[PDB]
């Protein structure tokens, strides 16, 4: 009744505060929090600190904690402890490199109880907003660090968060109950099992049997046709947010043939964006157009559409010197076909109906697209190192987009750097992304996002595909479903059955 059951694809994992997976981004977020909380309006508001200062300079920040909260053990929440997972972080901080404030922190002390000083190595902007995200920077309580430190595992794992996990079944289920001690709002639910269900459509058949009573994702939480049935159904209850970010191809600037311009922009003509929406998504997606939609921060930016128009496709690749042999319907040029390998996880139904799609609509154009559908992690190895012509990607959502996604084209072991790196102007771009991010003059912030999101728009970097949504499925006693500011976080303390 004040008990629900839901469903995620894996179990949570260990939930340590400070690593990556097997850990989950929403169940991080469910048992650690961290000292300043992000809002909708992109703001951060007073969490675990109650108030900060920061120098002239914009390097020292000097944060007041409140003085009343404990760890689910018991144990207090003051500053030594915060200091404390600060340094089991940093004692790890290469496995942080995508993250810049993981590179700026340059000192962190607690100076009483109460105040803690973070001195960064510039005026860094998203300093606060990234001290909000799910992780690393969150706080455990020290007394579970394993030999003084969390990078190599940690024992229970005791937050100060609304929620506590009771217990952990690997391959089945994850429980978790509210901390009735919170320093916070009690959440009304009081207890949470999560059903480890990995395919989409077995996740819709636990629904419609009442297995469980809620399903939260995005758009590749069940089958798109199955949840447009479901809306209509008066027996539940369906929700479909405002988009939270984009999908899209990144293509190999640095491999031929798309090294190429000409054949990048004829790309970014050649596909029907709403017809695809309709087709594999089953019309409940938005198109994209640009990187970032209009509505990001820094990004309204009047950049100019590539429309679907395979006869301008066409065109752009007749002026490169791409044309059609005598009776092939692939074109060459220099002796070579205009063949590309699309790389995609092959298990995923989803992404496979889209690539057949870009596949098809390439062939219209005479671009030989061949699908590679692979294992996940070896598509993961593939976008470290370039091994790939198009790959499917997406961006992070807020609070994450623009900055950190941007931040993060410049690792060399991330697909977007990856597929920038033939750019003649990439050691521009990065160069303008470090100094973006250290911006106080509000002119200059806007003005280097413009020329990096401008440069990466008119060079044919990205195909954008969609602006995605989160959706939600629910036994109609559960009401309205809220969504979190943070795109990755799930709100269930702010369920009220
Ligand atoms: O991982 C995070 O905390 C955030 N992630 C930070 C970078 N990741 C570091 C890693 O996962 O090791 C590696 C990473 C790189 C490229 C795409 C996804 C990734 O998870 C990005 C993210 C934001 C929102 C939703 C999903 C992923
Ligand atoms: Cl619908
Ligand atoms: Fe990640």
């Known amino acids: 009744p004040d008990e629900i059951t839901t469903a995620w694809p894996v179990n949570v994992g260990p939930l340590n505060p400070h690593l990556y997976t097997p850990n989950q981004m929403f169940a991080q977020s469910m048992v650690y929090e961290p000292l300043v909380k992000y809002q909708a309006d992109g703001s951060v508001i007073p969490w675990l600190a109650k108030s900060w200062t920061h120098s002239e300079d914009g390097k020292t920040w000097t944060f007041t904690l409140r003085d009343d909260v404990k760890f689910s053990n018991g144990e207090p929440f003051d500053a030594e402890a915060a200091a404390e997972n600060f340094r089991a972080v940093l004692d790890n901080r290469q496995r942080h490199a995508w993250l810049e404030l ?3 922190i340059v000192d962190v ?7 803690l000083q973070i001195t960064l190595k510039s005026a860094y902007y998203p300093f606060l907003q990234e001290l909000a995200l799910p992780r690393p920077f969150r706080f455990i309580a020290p007394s579970q660090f394993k030999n003084h430190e969390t990078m190599n595992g940690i024992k229970a794992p005791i937050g100060t968060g609304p929620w506590i996990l009771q217990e952990s079944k690997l391959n089945q289920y994850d429980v978790f109950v ?13 207890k949470i ?3 480890v269900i990995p395919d989409p459509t077995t996740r819709a058949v636990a629904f419609e049997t009442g297995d469980i009573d809620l399903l939260y994702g995005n758009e590749g939480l069940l089958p798109l046709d199955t949840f447009a049935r479901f809306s209509q159904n008066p027996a539940y209850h369906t929700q479909l947010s405002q988009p939270i970010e984009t999908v899209m191809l990144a293509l190999n600037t640095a491999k031929a043939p798309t090294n190429e311009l000409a054949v990048r922009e004829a790309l970014n003509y050649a596909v029907n964006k709403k017809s695809l929406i309709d087709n594999a998504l089953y ?4 198109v994209a157009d640009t990187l970032f939609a209009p509505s990001v921060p820094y990004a309204n930016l009047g950049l100019k559409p590539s429309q679907y128009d395979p006869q301008k496709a066409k065109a752009l690749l007749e002026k490169a010197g791409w044309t059609l042999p005598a009776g092939k319907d692939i074109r060459e040029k220099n002796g070579q076909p205009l063949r590309i390998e699309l790389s995609f996880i092959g298990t995923d139904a989803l992404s496979k109906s889209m690539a057949e799609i870009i596949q098809a609509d390439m062939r ?6 061949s699908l590679i559908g692979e294992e996940e992690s070896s598509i993961y190895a593939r976008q470290r190192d370039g091994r790939f012509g198009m790959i499917f990607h997406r961006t992070w959502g807020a609070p994450y987009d623009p900055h950190a996604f941007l931040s993060s084209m410049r690792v060399p072991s991330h697909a977007d750097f990856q597929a920038q790196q033939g750019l003649a102007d990439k050691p521009l771009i990065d160069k303008e992304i470090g100094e973006v991010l250290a911006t106080h003059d509000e002119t200059q912030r806007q003005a280097l996002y413009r020329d990096i999101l401008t440069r990466l728009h008119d060079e044919a970097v990205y195909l954008p595909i969609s602006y995605i949504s989160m959706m939600v ?8 479903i809220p969504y979190a500011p943070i795109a990755t976080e799930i709100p269930f303390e702010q369920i009220k059955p």
């Open 193 to 195: 099992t999560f059903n």
């Open 178 to 190: 509210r901390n009735e001690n919170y320093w916070g709002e009690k959440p009304a639910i009081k």
């Open 473 to 480: 499925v629910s036994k109609p006693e559960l009401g309205n």
């Open 283 to 286: 019309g409940t997606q938005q």
């Open 109 to 115: 002390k607690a100076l009483s109880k109460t105040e």
């Open 364 to 369: 219209q154009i005479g671009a030989d697209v």
């Open 102 to 104: 993981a590179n700026q």
